[PDB]
Amino acid sequence: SQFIKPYNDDPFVGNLATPVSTSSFTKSLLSNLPAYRAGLSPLLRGVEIGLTHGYFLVGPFYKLGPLRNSDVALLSGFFSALGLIVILVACLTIYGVVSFEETEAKDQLQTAKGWRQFTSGWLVGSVGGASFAYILISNIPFLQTAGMSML
């Protein structure tokens, strides 16, 4: 048995079919991620990705930022995470302007209208996920420490 084969039956394309690349488990994960999942509008793809990324962004800023030992650390962690999100949304916006020409179609990410929808969703989701992480950390003492409240 051989686990490595040419990519999509083509021996001369610059890729290989390896278990990491093209196993059934890998195919299931890639196909079900919001970027690639079927039946999702570009805006909804942006929302789901945004919620995930904004939620984890708050934590490193809060625990390791300059104001970490202060009593305003969570507020600083939220503002710095929000500041990063605002910069990232601008990165998405400028990419959309140069990369895609204007066309009628709006149902795909790699279209000017579609990329704009993805940016709108990602902005709202990142603000929403960062806000959710803020509420949870503000109220639950386990999250404020590293779980160190139990010891």
């Binding site: 048995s1 051989q2 686990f3 490595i4 084969k5 990519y7 999509n8 079919a17 390896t18 278990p19 690349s21 093209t22 196993s23 059934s24 488990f25 139990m150 010891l151």
Partner: protein, 104 residues
Amino acid sequence: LSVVAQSKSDFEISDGTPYTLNVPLVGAASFIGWVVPTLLPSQIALYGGKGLSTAFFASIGTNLAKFPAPPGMTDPFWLLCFIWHSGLFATMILGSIGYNGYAG
């Protein structure tokens, strides 16, 4: 258990090749095959008169009683578990090779 020793879901270790991972049989057999020799006792302070498997099981029990507190650096838990896991991984690897490849 992505696929068991049966033709359930159409699993493919790669693009077009289906391959039955024998996760029940290999995991069970590797676990038992490693554990029975590992029971061998030894009057060494790390084991404490038990075998490696029994001492590792005892170490989980003693550290689970102090559930939030982790085992310390000099605690025998870290040595017992690392050796037991290393042997288990090796017998799982060798078991997967033997069963999937030789098929008998």
